[PDB]
């Protein structure tokens, strides 16, 4: 119970952020269904590269958005309580559903 969701755009950063928390709960937890890939967002933002006519000249910009889930089933309350106040993810927010 009490799953943890992360919304990041760097595959290595999200990989390490989900590979730290899972053993943070596994210090004294157990079970855990396992890592899940989760779907991703995709948006193609185009903008006129030239400031004067010639619409054909453009460029393609995109932003990634990865998601990671752990789905712990039966952990101990100690480690899930210890999850808070130990936040180290800088510039990226974590999503938790009560």
């Amino acid at each position: 119970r009490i799953r943890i969701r992360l919304k990041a755009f760097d595959h290595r950063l999200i990989d390490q952020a989900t590979a730290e928390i899972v053993e943070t709960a596994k210090r004294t937890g157990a079970q855990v269904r396992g890592p899940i890939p989760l779907p991703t967002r995709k948006e193609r933002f185009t903008v006129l590269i030239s400031p004067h006519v010639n619409k054909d000249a453009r460029d393609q910009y995109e932003i990634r958005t990865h998601l990671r889930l752990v789905d712990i089933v039966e952990p101990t309350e100690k480690t899930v309580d210890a999850l808070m106040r130990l936040d180290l993810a800088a510039g990226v927010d974590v999503q938790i559903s009560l």
Binding site: V47, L48, P51, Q60, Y61, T65
Partner: protein
Amino acid sequence: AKQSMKAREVKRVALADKYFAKRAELKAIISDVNARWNAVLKLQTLPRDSSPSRQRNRCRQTGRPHGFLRKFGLSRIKVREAAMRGEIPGLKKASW
């Protein structure tokens, strides 16, 4: 880059929230078909300009109305100017 233009836009967006969200609410309360009478038509003291729907919300860097972008609140040229400088996370060149 008209500074009187930018002053008008700044003051209208400043008055786009303090003078709004309550006059429109009053109208919506009195806009019901059940009797609406001449009160709603006689309560037209609003300039009808401070409403955000009828307000451009121009770009606030060099005052170019063209290419207004909701995602960044900028114009195309300055998006190129700043994004290429980095400092905007998550933005990489797109290909597929």
